[PDB]
Every structure is written in structure tokens, then in C-alpha cells.
Design a protein around this ligand. Structure first.
Ligand SMILES: Cc1ncc(COP(=O)(O)O)c(C=O)c1O
Ligand SMILES: Cc1ncc(COP(=O)(O)O)c(C=O)c1O
Ligand SMILES: Cc1ncc(COP(=O)(O)O)c(C=O)c1O
Ligand SMILES: Cc1ncc(COP(=O)(O)O)c(C=O)c1O
Lengths: 461, 507, 453, 463
């Protein structure tokens, strides 16, 4: 068809709230054809590996309740994926939806010349919400943009001081824009795109001595380290918790060598680990803090890079040194201001702690019961993972859970590991249903394995 | 206060549609204090340079009509800034607002595990809307992200073919993320952040022979070019139009050397130049096309990177090779689908042509009338610029226009140049009001100058010769001070003082 | 065998001045086996492509006269290869051999702690010999080392000034050490070894406007140029002469943008183009000058990097910033001091001019006569090339010349192009014999072709 | 003057074997003026810091015996500097001088088109002399060129295998050419010349776990290691001996990750540590071995890069991929062939062991006696160092030794550390004279210190 015809057919679909069997069958059939012909036929192959065929062709339609998703066939899913840590305050949180709706009625995007007042308000808010000397905020549209901004603040601070080297950690995930991907550590994500930014070096996560070595060797050779960047807990790494005091030691180590400390709280921020930021567990103040995902309330894309006056002041003489067109737009600021208001009003950080403790205990118990399938369960607050024995078992679990209308998925920088990242608003009853679904899934998986194994050993001579 | 207290005070402000004198005075005072203490005190200094004091402290409040903005004091501005090419279909275009409102009621952000249907629909739409073999779309949240995606598609296609070098053009602006900024060409934007991506080289824009040379020399030395990236017309460069046929020649040149052609239509896309894409003027099909700004309808942030099946197929075996969390979200897709529907239904590309022709004629005439102030006016469709004689005159114009409630601003990779980028929906009457405002501004500027001052010729010529004779400067330094002096004759006293200092210092 | 046994057999061979048929046959057979098993079996394949089989297995033995080489079978060759521009003052120039012999009797290599007096003397000599404000000399062991030193002087001068980009030219050859190879321009020499030094960009040779563009674009993007490096005439490029005034323009262009001018006279230096340095043709003073090959007199390996006090003074606060163990050794300095003495005493620069004019005229005439085989002949002084129509014809010429006991070979950054780089001491009679050999070679090549059909 | 005039005056000086007081005074005065005006006035400042003035202006004239140097004033020095590890077989070793003299009479430099037979002979010799599967030799003119060749062999082998990262060690010294300097580890030698080759990372020397980490992390991030390069013992680092088995472990570690092992034996090679190569102590076979300094016999500049057929075969299809004009020249080959013959015939590796053990014991004993001045003495064979308490004490020792006509000097990647690198041919009596000179030097230094202190205290009491 013409573009006009397709743009029309699609606006008509946006208005529709419901689909009869025929409208559903037609839309499902279209979305699969169009993913294949215009988006990525690879996404259809992946979703098959993590489903029992026919289930891969599930099409999102609307939010059910705070903690559920409904497909085009009316099937309601409990959300333990949380859009990879976006939906901290649930799906269509009425307070966030309200703030966005209200700003949409006045001015959704700004001129970038007149002072936009929600930018000023969210910056003031984030300054009050953040620890210590974190004071200035730069707004962008994603995690990867927030990391680019951080790397850039560090570069501008440190190049006149003669420092250009950056240290990241293996298993680390900081985004996929080429500046961010220089810090991202997974080989398969980096190799095609090399050469990446020069002067990026990786040490093991949670190993302070390896990091000391790297900083010291860089100092010896005249390749002095501008910054260390790390996640307080590695998400895509498979929920990798550092040894206690590690973050505090990295801060002293950065202080000693005159390197800037960059904390990537894109995925651990906005209450998910049981505090507003995972750096609050140790009362660690980085030089630069990166936020996205949940900051937009599961309604708007937004990122934020917050830094000390000492570091951020690099942008004061020429405020156009770093810019973006959409960053700090009124819809996004409204969504973030709502999200902070919701998390604080309802003490959802405290809820994440209680519910995470409850869920992790549940999973650790299933791990004890199914060591043939599960290596270990880890977490902190509502950031959790189950590591299975091998990759194919992890995929069978994702499918079994999906069959039972519970939504989980794999981690990026870690195969065979399933993230459990539900909304902080997940109810105690849903928490219990999740554990029962997990149990039913593991029992079904054990049968599959035992069956196969008989149907194999038969082969001999 | 607590964060809770500030988040509350701010949600209260989001609900309010009106401000009495007291609410306005209190909010203005807050926004200025908070910009200074938590955003950037630099932005307050810049806005002063481009206003008569008290005017710098104008605070955005809401959209007036399709083509106007209203501050906290109720002053309505005609928008010739267009948010730097975002507001193609105007402020709160009811069709776009409607689509976003409708999708917000179902699902604003997606899971990233279930197939999201608006992604599929917008991708199908963009495939039909785009020229030739452009077929696959990757959605992100900004121009800079769309450029990163393009660079990444090229890298993945070309590294197994042994090609790693990228060519961009001087004056070029492709974004500020470190991959994008490797292609961005302005010194002041790059130097603090070097070293940038290796293998990035710059040729003059609109010079096919310089580009041939660069590709050929790279081939000779074994540093073969993976891709050429260029804007069809340089926006931040100051609306720099290439010679006609240039784009067509770059395409044949890329075809000959086996390099991928990347077109950055972030700022020339969605009808702004008089066609849906500026590559349609010459019927040029790039390998990879970058879109953002206007694609979101002035409601949502979105970027799109569209490419051939041949190039994009690099993402098919591992679909996680390039991803983003928010990219291709349902709100953004709804906003884009609406925007395309609006541009096509109302033939706004055709309107941009007519209104741009009208506005450019107006500006070229004011240029004829005020050669003491204006060097030249250029444009294509509703992408236009006025180059003034010097930077300070450009700033005086922006201020005079703002005094008269018409919103313009400067370009990034070009000082003393004012962009005129109004909504394609600007009415013929507003077009005329814009020209009258410009005229009034230039007349007032002439008076300011003529306020017992203007001539300074020999005053300048004296500085040229004194600077040239100072015996302790090297030839790069003398050359840097004389380029400053002829480029901006109104700083001859300042530049002379500076040169005398450094001459004394090398005795 | 043991190493002791092989080191013994070889010292025995070094003492021998003559080989009977049996000693020759045994040594030839050994050298081919050992090239194959321990050096490079590739060198044996190349030498075959540029010979009529049996001729590829020629083994160097000794210098004949100033301008000839003798193989193990006693066959004497007129040398028009000149070891690629080493043998400017001939083979075993008695004045150079004498100086080396004399220093070998006192101290061949230095301590690197006591002031070594020939270093001081050769540096003083090179300062007097070089144009203008070229004053300080750093001694190394090769062309590539002399270029590394130049690149390093530029880096140390310009990094505190915020400039890091370097411009070289396509067809350019500056050596094969990884710093030098970043400036070297031929793809097949660079691709395996990438990534090379960052911030190295190439413009066409002899195109001042292309170079202006590159400097200007680098300035616009904040990647300002530290230095331009170029050969005054590209040797490995195939004897590529720049347009007149080009070098002078590059100097003004460097002056304007505040970039350092590096001239690589490794192959055009020590009189080969008709002056002591090719930069003297236009009276061009670079910031940094690179020398090797002929500077050692065809006896010693040496390189020299000479620069202004302004640039070299980067090494004054810490004189260990750039060092080499063997560089500026007394044998090498003795050899260079002798070589300069010989070139000046006998006005061999002037001879190179006259003999090059004579030889080039001869070749241009053969080009007129054999356009089926020869595209063109070029040169300046005793730096000359014949470009053939295609690569295989160039190889047939090298072979035909070798069959007639005249030694020529191909260029590096240019196929199908044969360098003629004889000693400046080549006699007028030899010059004429060379032209007659070339004629006989082309006539035989024409027959081969006409045959084939 | 004209260049002709100076080239003449200098050839006149090359012929002279003797200088009366007037010829000496005139030549010394010239050499100092010319170092200042045309070489480096910095060399004159450095040599002052390591002498009592008047002594800084000592000018080399000729070799005395195998193990001594004579200045323009006829003062004979015992050589414990060894030209930083060049003079393994002494000054003007008659066997080396003979081979060079003999080849000079036939063909000193080659055409580079005809097969040069000494290249073939030295390559065959070095193949027999080297351990295991080391088979192919490429000849150059210096240590830094030999390292460039190694880096290049690795790059050509490993880039088609998708590996581009190189690991070196801190304190490491591999040369000053920009490829080599990318592996060299001292800050002050690198910073002015950055950016250097990309893909170069440094681990601590003698720390196998730090190196494992680096290889593993590079593998995880897709920046896989092409090669490890290290000295078996760091010379410029200040004679840093790795823990025993380190080299063996690095070899297994390289084998595990598929990285090439490059051993830089430029300074530990040709018998200096008590074996022909320091890699023979642990029977470690690297993929690529680098040689220079002593390989030329203290007569000729030469470097050699030797590698497996597996690695070197990258140069077989295009033999012009890596070349040099002077490399593998007949004089240099003659000098190297002589040097190998001398080292093997006279078992100088075994002598280096015995004499080094003797000298190191002597120094360790002086360390016990002078802990106020000396931190420690280390070595292996005739590769030795004395670390002093502070830099200025190190310089006072170098001066005191020079005053007593014994030649020592500092290390590059280590201040306050004096290298003792005498010819392997140093006689037992000279060994003893060296120890006595060291003793006399330390005793004089102690008196200087003790005197200062006495002067201070009395002035104070006097108040
Ligand atoms: C720790 C971390 N950093 C950065 C990102 C990238 O965020 P975005 O996809 O919005 O660019 C992610 C997303 O998964 C993340 O988990
Ligand atoms: C041509 C072009 N590309 C890229 C960008 C950057 O887009 P964003 O600001 O959305 O990152 C701009 C912004 O002005 C632009 O004009
Ligand atoms: C211009 C130029 N530079 C550098 C070199 C390299 O000299 P070497 O082979 O001694 O390193 C050459 C050799 O042909 C040359 O012609
Ligand atoms: C171990 C080592 N490698 C390399 C070099 C550099 O060798 P050259 O000075 O011959 O360039 C040296 C010199 O001191 C060295 O000791």
C-alpha cells in the first residue's frame, strides 16, 4: 500500500480498545509478516527459542493492572521482566499517566531557547534526592545517552589534567552507542564495531586488587586513568553482587589516583535494590551518577546524568558543549517528577526490600530442591536472577513460565541466567503466585529432562 | 526542601493552566534560581547575550496555536525556531496529540519481549514512505542515537570486508554522543573529548573532487572507506546548500569505491525542505537514512535508522547485536505514525516549498536593503538562515525579534547565522508578520549602530598593519590574528591589545 | 651440525678470497638451501621472476672495481642498482675503506658514557654541510630509524602545542619500522600491520592544493597537523618528480599552519640528484632532514636526523629521551666523514648531474624507439627510472640486463618500473655500455613478444 | 669552516694513534664545543652529575686491552659498563676484528639483489644455536629494529586470526622506535610521543596471576591478545629477576590463550647471564626471539629476530613485506659469526656464571657493610646492579668509581641503580680490582657524609 494508507490503518488500530477474533487474527498475522519484512526476522527466531511455538507470536496490546500485561488474545501476564527495570512503579501508574496527560495538554516538547520550568524542577528534585555533592543534572533520552554524557563530563574534566584512560569491568553493560559500548564488556556486542574509543580497559568486577593494579600500571606507563565506570550490581552480567565494602574501596581508590568515579545506576536506580540508589547501601558518593529506565515511570523515555559542581562546571563557559534536542523535555520531566513522587509517597524502596527478600527466599528454596536444573538464585531487592545449569534449561524455564502467563526473560551479558525484575508494586499474592509458577515450571522441566535421557541412553553398541 | 516536597510542588504546577502575577513572579524566580543551581548557569548568560535583560528570564508555559508559544507572563511568540526542526506539524498537532493520548490509555512503554505492533506498523510505513530498497527500520530516541545506529550498521557490514575508515564533511553536525561526535566536525565540540573513534576523516562539503581524492588516497594506503556520512544540507553549518547534482555524484562515488552512503536527514527530513526527504530533490537512495526531530510530531522524542536488507541483514543472526530500552516504544510510534499521516494528508511538504520560497524572497529583499547588517539569506523549503556581517549583529537581531514576540535563535557549527525553521503549518499571514518583524528589527539595529557611531575603517586598517609588523609573532599567530580581524572587524581594539601582549612575551 | 661447526665453516669462508669450481658449486648449493630453510624461500621465487633460470642462483662474492660486483663464478656486473642508493661513492671507495680500517684499529664501537669524538666531528661537519638553521644531529643505524627520530622530534615539539596529526603523500616510502610505516603509503606494506600510529593522513604527491585542504580540514575539526613528511622525489614511488616550486610551497604552507616540515632525503641525499641534497635545487630548508643509505659510503650502516635548535632543543633537558645503543658509533662516523670528504673533494654531485643528463637522454631515446615496451623514462641526476607498459615487461628487462651483466632491479611502491641508481663514480664509458645493454635488452624483448604470436 | 675542511681535519684525527698534551687539549676543547653546539648540551650536563668536574670532559680514544678503554689523556679504564651489554667478548676481540677486516677486503655492504652468503650462513648458525623450532632469522641494525620486526611478525600472524592486543610489563625496555616504544613501559620515555600504537597494555613483571587476568579480560571483551613481549630479566628496570618458573608459566599461559611469546634477549643474550640465552635457564622456547648489542661482537651494529617456521612463514608469499637496506650486511654477519665462534670456543657463558657469582658475592658483601649507602645488589651471570639508598648516592658512586678508572653508569627505567655489565672476558684479577674500587668508593662516600654531619653538629653546638 501507500504510506498514507498504512499510516491511516495504524491510527485506526491506535483508537481501537478491543479486537474480535477476526481483528486479532488479522493483526497478529500482520505484525509477524512486518517484523519479518521490516524490523528483524531474528527477533522471531529468538522468541521461538524461549517459547512452545504459537506462543512466540504473542503481540502486546495494553496494561492489565499495575503488574500485568495483556496480549491481543486477552491473555493476562504477571510481569517479572519489568521491561528490564523500567516498570518500577507498575504499568500505567495513574499518578505518572496523570502528570504526562496534564503536560501533554500544555506543551509536550520544548523550544530549547526559553527556560523550560520542569527541567529546573526535576533538576532541583534530583539534587535533593541524590547523595552529598551531586548537584547538577543533564537530561537525555536513554541509559546509553546518560553514559555518553558521563564519559564526556569525565573527558572534559580530565583531558586538561592529562588523563585519557577509562577502566570498566568485565560482564559490565553501559549501553550500545559507540561511546557507551567502549565501556560495555561483552565480546559479541563489541567485536563487530571495533575499533571503539581508544584507552578503554577492563578489570574483573568485585576485585579491588585487580583494579588497583590497572590504575597503578596506567600511572607507571604515563596512561593515567581519567575515570572508573561500573554498575553497583551488574544487571546484564546476571545480577552480580560485589563483595561487601567493594564500592567504598573503589571510591577511596579513585580518590587516591585522582580518577573520577562513574556509577551506572541505569538499572539499579529508582528504588529497585531496596534503596532509591544502590550506592546508598554503602553511602558511596560517585563523581557522576547515570539514571534511565524506571526514572520515566514506565511511560516516558528519559535519562539523567548527575555530577558534582566541580565536574559539571566544565559545561558552564560554553553550555552548548554537550546538548541533545529532546533531552529534559516537559513530558519526560513530568513523568520523572511523578515517578519520584510515587516512590517516596508509597515507600516502594522499602517494599522492594521486603518483596525481594520474600521472592529470593522462595527461589533459593527451589534451587535447593532442583540442583539438577538450577545452579543458584541471587538478588538484592527486586533485582534478582536464577542461574540454570546450562543455557537450554534457562530457555525451557522462560517458556514454561510464559505458558503459565508469567513474564521473565534472559540477561544480555550472561547466558543460561533468567532475570526476575517485577514492578516494585507487585502484590504479596502475585509474589506467591510467581514462586508457585516457578515450582510448576521446574517440575515440568525435570520430567522433560528425565524423559529425553531415557529416550537417549537406549543407543548402544 | 525534601525531594517529596519539590516533586509535589511541581505536580501541582503541571496541573495549573494559568498563573496570576504572583504565581508567575514566584515560578520565574524559582526557575532562574534552579537553572543557576542545578542545570547550567551558562544557559542564563547565553540567553542574556541574545536578549535585552529581563527578556532572558522568559519561561515557557504552553503552546498557543499550531505556530505560537506562550510564556508564564502570557506573551505569545510566533515560532521561527521550530525547536531546531522538531515542530514540522506545529505545537500540539491535534492528530498527533490524539494518537499519543489514545496509546497512553493502552500501553505507553513496551515490555521488549512481546512483539509490539506499532513498531511493525511504523517500520512498514517508513519502508513505503522511503525511496527504493530502504526496507528495515531500527528505532531509537534521538538524532545522535540514529547516527550511532548508522555508523554501527556500516561498521558491521564493512569490517568483514576489511573497511574501517569513515568520511564526513567540515561544518557537519551528526550529534554529540561520542560515536556521532566522531563525524560532527566543529573543533570546539570535539577537542575536549578526543581521542574520538579512530578512522574518521573530513573533506569540504559540496566538493566532489576533494571527496574522490580522500576515497582514492584511503584506497592507495590500505585504509579503505567503509562509509561516507553527510547532511544533504548542513543545518548547524548555517544552511549550507551543496551545488546541484552533488548528492547524486557522492552516490556514484560511493558505488564506485564500494563505500556505504549514510544520509543524516535528522534535520532535513519530514517535509522541511519541500519534500518528505531532501534526498528526493535528486532522487538519491542512500544505503542508510537517519531520521529524528520532526518524526515525533513535536510531541515524542524518536529516532529512526532505515537501511537496505543488504546492510541491515547484519542484525538478523543476532538481533541483540544493537538494541535500546525505550526505542520504538508505542507512544513514540503512535506520534510518528500520526506525523506521517498529517504531512501526507495536508501536503505540508508542498506548503514548506511555497512558504519557504515566500519567506526566503522576503529575507533576500531585506538583505538587499540592509547590506550594512546582513551578508546573505539562504534556504530550501522551510530550512533557512540569515548570515549577518558579524556575530554581535546576529545576536542583536535575535533580541530585536524576541522583543517583537518572534522566536529565532543561532546555529551550532556557524556563529553570526540565525536559523529560520518555522512549523510547515505557519500561516501565510504569520509568514508576512515574520517578514515585517525582521524589517522592524533591522531598522532598529541600523539606528543603534548610527547612534553617533558606524565608520571605523582606517581604525581597523591601522590594526591590520600594526599586527603584521610586531616583530616577535610566528606566521601561524599573525595569520590567526589577521583572520580574526577581517572575519570580524568590530574587535580590532581587543585583537590589537592581545597581539601586543604575546609579542612582548616572546622578545 | 653444531653452531660451533657452522661458525667455523663460515669464518673459513670469510678468509678465502677465491673459490675453485668445486668450492663455488658447494657454496652456491649451501646458500640456496640455507636461504630456503632459514632466511626466506620467497626471495628465491622473486629472483627467478627477474632472471632466466640458473641466473637467479647468483651469489655475491666481492667488489670488482668502484662500479662493479663479482659473483662466486667470477662474473663481473656493472652496478646500476647501487644497492638502492647506498653506493654513491662506489664499491670499497679506498678513502672510506681507509677511514673504517683506521678507526677499527682504535675503537669500532663506543661506551655511550665518554664523549665519542667522531660523533662531535660528524655533527659539526653535517651542520656546515646542511642548509640554514639545520644545526643538531642525532645518529642511528638506518633510514627507518632516522624517520622514527624525525617523527619523534616533531611529536615532542608539537604535543605541548596541542598538535598530533601527521600528513604524508601516497607513493611515499619512509621505512618499515612501525612509526615510519605509518608514513609509508603502499597498502600491501601497511594492511597486515594495522592498526598503525593514529593521526596519519595521506594526500597526493606534488598537489599543493590537496595538501592545503588536508591541513585546513584538520584545523577546522580540531585535529591540527604537527608535521608534513615527504621525499623531495619519490624513490620507491618510481622516481616521481614534483612540479617545480612544490617543495617551496609546502614550506610556506607548513609555515602558515604552524606545522613542521620533515624532508626524507634517505634516498635523494649525498649528491645522488646532482646536489648534496635534493632540497638544494629549490633552496628549501625543512625543520628536520633524514639521511641514510649513501651517508655510510657503501661500507657502514648509518642514519642521521638533523634539525633546527628550535626543534631539537626538546632533547636538551633529558638527553636520554631518544637514544640508540649503536647510533653515532665511531666506524659509522668514520665512514660518513670519509664519504662527505670524497663527495666534496671530487665534486661527485656535479658528476651525477652530467652523467644523469647523459643516461636519461639515452633512455628517453630508447623510449621513443620502443613505445611497445617502454611507457616513459624519468630522473634527476643519477636517480632514474624506466616505466614499462606492464609489470611482466619490466621483469623481462631486469633479466635481459642481468644476462648482459648489468645490475638493475624494481622499485617498492611502483611495479613495472626499473630504478637506474648507479654509483656517482660510474665512468662515461660504463654510462655508454649501460645504454647499449638497455638497447640490446629491448630488442631481445621485442623478438620474444613478436615470437609468442 | 667548510664541511670539506672539517671532514679532512677528522680523517687526519682517525689516522692518529697518539696525542701530545697540545693535540689532546685542542681535541678535548673541540669535542666539548661541538657536543654543545651540534649533538646535545644535555649530555655534558648529565656526565657532570656523575663526575667531579674536569672528569665529565673525558673523551674516548681507543681500546686498551680486551677489558679496558683509554681516553685522550692516556687514562685507562676497566670497563664495567660494557657499552650497556655490547662488549661481551671484550674491546677489539681479535677474532671478531679479524672476520670484519677480512670481509671489508671483499664486500662490506651488499647489493640486496644477489644472494649474500654470510646472511645464509649466520641464519643457519643462529638456527642451530637457538632452542627447538626457532628456525628463521631476519637481520636488522639495532635492538629497537629487532623488536619492531617481532611486533610485525606477531601482527601479520595474528590479525588474520582476529587478535590485535599486545601485553608488555611495567619497568620493561624494548627500544625507542615508536613500535618498540609502545611496549617500553617508562612514562618519561612515552608521554611526549603519545599517541603510540593502540592495543598495548602493561602488567607487573614477575606476576603470572596479573598476566592471566589481563589475557582473560581481553578475551572476555573481544580484545584478544596477539602476543606477550617481555625481557627474561629487566635490564633498564634495574636487573629485575622474575620469580623462578615465571617464564615457563608465561609460555604455558601464551600456549593456552593462543598468544605468541616474544622474548627480548637484546640485553640478556650472547652468554651474559651464564647461558647463551637467558631462556635456556628454564628451557623456555618463545615463538619469536630478539637479539642485538653483543651479537655484533662490540665491532658492528646488528639486530636479529628469529622465529618458528609457523610464524615467519607470513613473509614467504611476499618477501618484501618486511625489509631493511643495511640489515644482514656482510660486515655485520662476519662480526656476529665471529662472536658466536668466540663465545662457544672459549665457553664465555660458563665464565660469565663464575665471574658474576664472584662479583655479585663481592657487591652483596659491600651491601652488608654499607647499608647507609647501598639498598641491595642483584644479578645473574654478568648482568648485575647495585641499588643505592637515593639517586644522588648512586651518582656519587659512579663518580668515585670513574675517579678510580672503573667505568659504570646508571640504568634507564630505574634511578639510583648502577648497572655492572663488564665484558665476559673480564679477568679474575680485574674482577678483584673492581670489588676493591667499589670498596674504596663506598668508604670515601661514607667519610663525605660523616664529615658533613660533624660540621653541622659543631656549628649548632657553637651557637
Ligand atoms: C546498566 C545499564 N546501562 C545502560 C543501559 C542502556 O540503557 P538504554 O537502553 O536506555 O540506552 C542498560 C540497559 O539495559 C543497563 O542495564
Ligand atoms: C543533522 C543533525 N543530526 C543530529 C542531531 C542531533 O540529534 P539529537 O539532538 O536528537 O541527539 C542534530 C541536532 O540538531 C542535527 O541537526
Ligand atoms: C625515502 C626512504 N626512506 C626510508 C627508507 C628506509 O631505509 P632503511 O631501509 O635503512 O630503514 C628508504 C629506503 O629505501 C627510503 O628510500
Ligand atoms: C632489552 C633491550 N631492548 C631493546 C633495546 C634497544 O636497542 P637499541 O638501543 O639497539 O635500539 C635495548 C637497549 O638498551 C635493550 O636493553
Amino acid at each position: 500500500a501507500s504510506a498514507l494508507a498504512c499510516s491511516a490503518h495504524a491510527l485506526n488500530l491506535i483508537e481501537k480498545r478491543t479486537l474480535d477474533h477476526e481483528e486479532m487474527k488479522a493483526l497478529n498475522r500482520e505484525v509477524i509478516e512486518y517484523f519479518k519484512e521490516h524490523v528483524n526476522p531474528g527477533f522471531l527466531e529468538y522468541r521461538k527459542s524461549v517459547t512452545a511455538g504459537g506462543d512466540y507470536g504473542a503481540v502486546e496490546w495494553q496494561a492489565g493492572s499495575l503488574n500485568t500485561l495483556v496480549d491481543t488474545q486477552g491473555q493476562e501476564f504477571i510481569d517479572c521482566l519489568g521491561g528490564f527495570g523500567i516498570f518500577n512503579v507498575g504499568h500505567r501508574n495513574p499518578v505518572v499517566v496523570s502528570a504526562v496527560q496534564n503536560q501533554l495538554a500544555k506543551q509536550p516538547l520544548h523550544s530549547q531557547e526559553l527556560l523550560d520550568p520542569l527541567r529546573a524542577m526535576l533538576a532541583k528534585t534530583l539534587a535533593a534526592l541524590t547523595p552529598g555533592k551531586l548537584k547538577y543534572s543533564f537530561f537525555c533520552n536513554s541509559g546509553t545517552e546518560s553514559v555518553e554524557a558521563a564519559l564526556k563530563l569525565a573527558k572534559a574534566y580530565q583531558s586538561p589534567r592529562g588523563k585519557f584512560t577509562f577502566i570498566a569491568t568485565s560482564g559490565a553493560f553501559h549501553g550500545k552507542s559507540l561511546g557507551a559500548l567502549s565501556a560495555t564488556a561483552k565480546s559479541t556486542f563489541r567485536k563487530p564495531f571495533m575499533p571503539l574509543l581508544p584507552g578503554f580497559r577492563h578489570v574483573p568486577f568485585g576485585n579491588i586488587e585487580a583494579m588497583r593494579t590497572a590504575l597503578n600500571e596506567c600511572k607507571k606507563t604515563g596512561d593515567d586513568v581519567a575515570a572508573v565506570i561500573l554498575e553497583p550490581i551488574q544487571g546484564e552480567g546476571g545480577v552480580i553482587l560485589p563483595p561487601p565494602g567493594y564500592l567504598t574501596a573503589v571510591r577511596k581508590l579513585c580518590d587516591e589516583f585522582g580518577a573520577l568515579m562513574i556509577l551506572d545506576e541505569v538499572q539499579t536506580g529508582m528504588g529497585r535494590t531496596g534503596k532509591m540508589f544502590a550506592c546508598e547501601h554503602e553511602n558511596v558518593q560517585p563523581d557522576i551518577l547515570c539514571l534511565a529506565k524506571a526514572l520515566g515511570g514506565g511511560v516516558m523515555p528519559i535519562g539523567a546524568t548527575i555530577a558534582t559542581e566541580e565536574v559539571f562546571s566544565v559545561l558552564f563557559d560554553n553550555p552548548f558543549l554537550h546538548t541533545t534536542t529532546f533531552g529534559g523535555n516537559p513530558l519526560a520531566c513530568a513523568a520523572a517528577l511523578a515517578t519520584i513522587n510515587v516512590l517516596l509517597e508509597q515507600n516502594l524502596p522499602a517494599q522492594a526490600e521486603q518483596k525481594g527478600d520474600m521472592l529470593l527466599d522462595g527461589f533459593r528454596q527451589l534451587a535447593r530442591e532442583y540442583p539438577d536444573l538450577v545452579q543458584e538464585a541471587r538478588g538484592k531487592g527486586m533485582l534478582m536472577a536464577i542461574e540454570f545449569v546450562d543455557n537450554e534449561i534457562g530457555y525451557n524455564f522462560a517458556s514454561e513460565m510464559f505458558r503459565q502467563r508469567v513474564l521473565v526473560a534472559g540477561t544480555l551479558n550472561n547466558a543460561k541466567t533468567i532475570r526476575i525484575e517485577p514492578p516494585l508494586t507487585l502484590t504479596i499474592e502475585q509474589c506467591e503466585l510467581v514462586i508457585k509458577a516457578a515450582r510448576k515450571a521446574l517440575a515440568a522441566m525435570r520430567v522433560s529432562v528425565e524423559e529425553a535421557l531415557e529416550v537417549s541412553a537406549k543407543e548402544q553398541q
